[PDB]
Design a protein around this ligand. Structure first.
Ligand SMILES: CCC[C@@H](CC(C)(O)O)[C@@H](CO)C[C@H](O)CCCCC(=O)O
Ligand code: NA
Lengths: 121, 120
């Protein structure tokens, strides 16, 4: 989805001032057309909950820098697979790259959960 | 959630060689108690599927590197909340620290999904 700023605030139930803080810290960004996506809703809701635990938007800036680097590693794997999707009537040619990107994200997420478990216990 | 190496191989359904390679490369590890967790099963499952698409275990090292650094940032945010847990009559409670850690991971995952969709 393509959400305006106001659409994002309504869906997230977060204050405009928190969104402004997250934008100015580079944590959240608009997509290339200047809209927000569905992930922005979740990011803003998590950021609000985290602010309530004393974590200010500027302290999430590292998460974003790391996410961008990981996204590039994932694109290296999935990008060349865009052309390899089945293109029959019933197919959509992007599905294979999406599947591969999703596997990589799941892998990565699980690695972080694992590493966190270990450092907190 | 405390899995032996055999439990991990049977649950993940991957070849012994793949696990061996992932261990050697540092991508998968046991916890401090010496065993594997439920996350290891998912990691192995995903790694096998990714291998089928071209991704060698060696190539997953960059993922592991990054995940460890992210866990260190998460520990810095969540670690101080261990002592703030709602222990009740107990001496300890890590539930707040776990919640903060879970939020942070969700946020980070969502940041990745957003960036991937943009790049692709
Ligand atoms: C939200 C759940 C995951 C997310 C995974 C992805 C594409 O970001 O890696 C996907 C679900 O597969 C969101 C979109 O529904 C997929 C549209 C195709 C875009 C793509 O190929 O990257
Ligand atoms: Na956009």
């Amino acid at each position: 989805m393509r959400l305006s700023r106001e659409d994002l605030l309504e869906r997230s139930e977060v204050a405009d001032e928190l969104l402004t803080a997250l934008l100015k810290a580079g944590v959240i960004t608009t997509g290339p057309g200047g809209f927000f996506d569905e992930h922005a809703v979740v990011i803003l809701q998590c950021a609000r909950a985290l602010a309530e635990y004393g974590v200010e938007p500027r302290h999430l800036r590292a998460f974003r820098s790391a996410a961008d680097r990981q996204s590039d590693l994932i694109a290296q794997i999935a990008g060349p697979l865009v052309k390899a999707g089945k293109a029959g009537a019933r197919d959509r040619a992007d599905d294979l790259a999406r599947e591969v990107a999703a596997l990589a994200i799941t892998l990565h997420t699980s690695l972080i959960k694992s590493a966190v478990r270990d450092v907190l216990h």
